[PDB]
Write a protein that binds this ligand. Structure first.
Ligand SMILES: c1ccc([C@@H]2Nc3ccccc3-c3nc4ccccc4n32)nc1
Ligand SMILES: c1ccc([C@@H]2Nc3ccccc3-c3nc4ccccc4n32)nc1
Length: 147
């Protein structure tokens, strides 16, 4: 369909350039990277400090480029533990200018009692879906290790 084709054009023009995660209370950077963890079809991996699980909230900065215009760029993310969804998060960025580069800041609040890092590590998958409005542009997964 015309929509399948537009989703592929948007994905072809998209890159996640860099990202970081901070403790929202202190501001300190807990994780950073420059690889595009949203590329579909391969399982990505990330190692995060275990103490991130004790944060009341984490702030994310996500820097991305897009050749295509988007009217309502947004994300749906699911935290899966051994295949079961524990939490779902929704975030909206909105309009994206064609051929722009953009930094998107989001706050992720903890929900309700966290299992220990040693039980979670290697058993959490974050599934990220990027949309333009109701159009699914890509689905990607990162497996998390807590260190
Ligand atoms: C390190 C850790 C988790 C991710 C994961 N995976 C992601 C992949 C593409 C874009 C954003 C993320 C991301 N946002 C997160 C917010 C809270 C917890 C995990 C989150 N992710 N990426 C790198
Ligand atoms: C604050 C906000 C969200 C979470 C969230 N909450 C989680 C709930 C169940 C399993 C894993 C997580 C989780 N892994 C994370 C890796 C990086 C950042 C946040 C992460 N989480 N933890 C503290």
């Amino acid at each position: 369909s015309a929509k399948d084709e537009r989703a592929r054009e948007i994905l072809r023009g998209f890159k996640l350039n860099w990202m970081n995660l901070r403790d929202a209370e202190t501001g300190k950077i807990l994780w950073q990277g420059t690889e595009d963890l949203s590329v579909p079809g391969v399982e990505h991996e990330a190692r995060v400090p275990k103490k991130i699980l004790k944060c009341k909230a984490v702030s994310r900065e996500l820097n991305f480029s897009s050749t295509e215009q988007m009217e309502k760029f947004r994300l749906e993310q699911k935290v899966y533990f051994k295949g079961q969804c524990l939490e779902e998060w929704f975030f909206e960025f909105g309009f994206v200018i064609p051929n722009s580069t953009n930094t998107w800041q989001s706050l992720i609040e903890a929900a309700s009692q966290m299992m220990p890092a040693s039980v979670l590590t290697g058993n959490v998958i974050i599934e990220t879906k990027f949309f333009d409005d109701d159009l699914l542009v890509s689905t990607s997964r990162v497996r998390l290790f807590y260190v």
